[PDB]
Amino acid sequence: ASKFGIGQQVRHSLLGYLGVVVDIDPVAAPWYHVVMEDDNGLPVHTYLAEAQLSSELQDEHPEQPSMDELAQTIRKQ
Amino acid sequence: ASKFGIGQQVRHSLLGYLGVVVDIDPVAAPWYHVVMEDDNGLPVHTYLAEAQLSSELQDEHPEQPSMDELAQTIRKQ
Amino acid sequence: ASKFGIGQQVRHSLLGYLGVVVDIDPVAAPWYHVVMEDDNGLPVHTYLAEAQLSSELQDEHPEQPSMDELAQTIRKQ
Structure with a gap:
């Protein structure tokens, strides 16, 4: 139903920025x-169609620790 | 009561960026x-006073298709 | 319980941008x-850990009036 999950680290398929999914809006993709x-x-709040997102492989980003911090925090909130 | 509507394409009166109204907050303008x-x-979530916004005339933006996509999607959600 | 309050002008401890607290999310800092x-x-919506924020001293920003306008407005909404 949803390709990406809340708390998952993702990248902008085009621009290549690192981010974290914090919510999903339903009703063809979400x-x-x-x-x-x-x-x-x-750490800017963006609104992106599913086609604009790609899974982020790495789990550790020394240059961007706050995004690792965000992902871990959200995966509990 | 409200100059701009949800789902309407607007521009920043000063910076000239293209955007889409996704919500409105009441209580002199909103x-x-x-x-x-x-x-x-x-596609960044911004919070703008009514005086900072202007109607966008064009309905088609080949350079910025995602904003056209957003406007159409929101006008149904 | 919370170092910064809603409606308070703050700065990014690292980048030094001017902003206004519009909400707080609990559950070690918020x-x-x-x-x-x-x-x-x-005026971009950002999501920042408490450690990334510092109190803004000045109450008047002639170069950035909209942030003064935001702070005053929110302190009543």
Whole structure:
């Protein structure tokens, strides 16, 4: 029903930014609420169609620790 | 009561970014929740006063299809 | 229980952007929903851990009036 899950680290298929899925909106694919670090590194709330997202393989990002921190935190909230 | 409507394509009166109104907050004008593509092209959730927004005339944006996609989708959700 | 309050002007401890706390998420410190102006000056919704935030001293920002406007408005909504 949903390709990506809440708390999963994802990347923008086009721009390649790192982010975390924080919510999903149903009703052909669903939209995703994802907190995503931009150019500067601001954890910015974005609204992205499922086709704009790709799974992030790595679980550790030393350059972007806050996104690892976010993913772990959300996976419990 | 509200100058702009949910699902309407708008532009930032100053910066000129393209966006879509996704929600409105009442109580002199109201604030708008609008998903708006920035420099890089991230559909970023912004919070803007009514005075910062202008109607977008065009209904078709080949350079920014996701904003057209967003507007149509929201106009049904 | 919470270091920063809703409606308080804050700065990103690292990047130094100006923003306003619009909501707080509990359950070791809490996360903050803060509307924050980026490079271009977009009032962007960001999600920040308490450790990423610092109190903003000044109450008047002539270069960024909308953040002063936001703070005052939210302190009543």
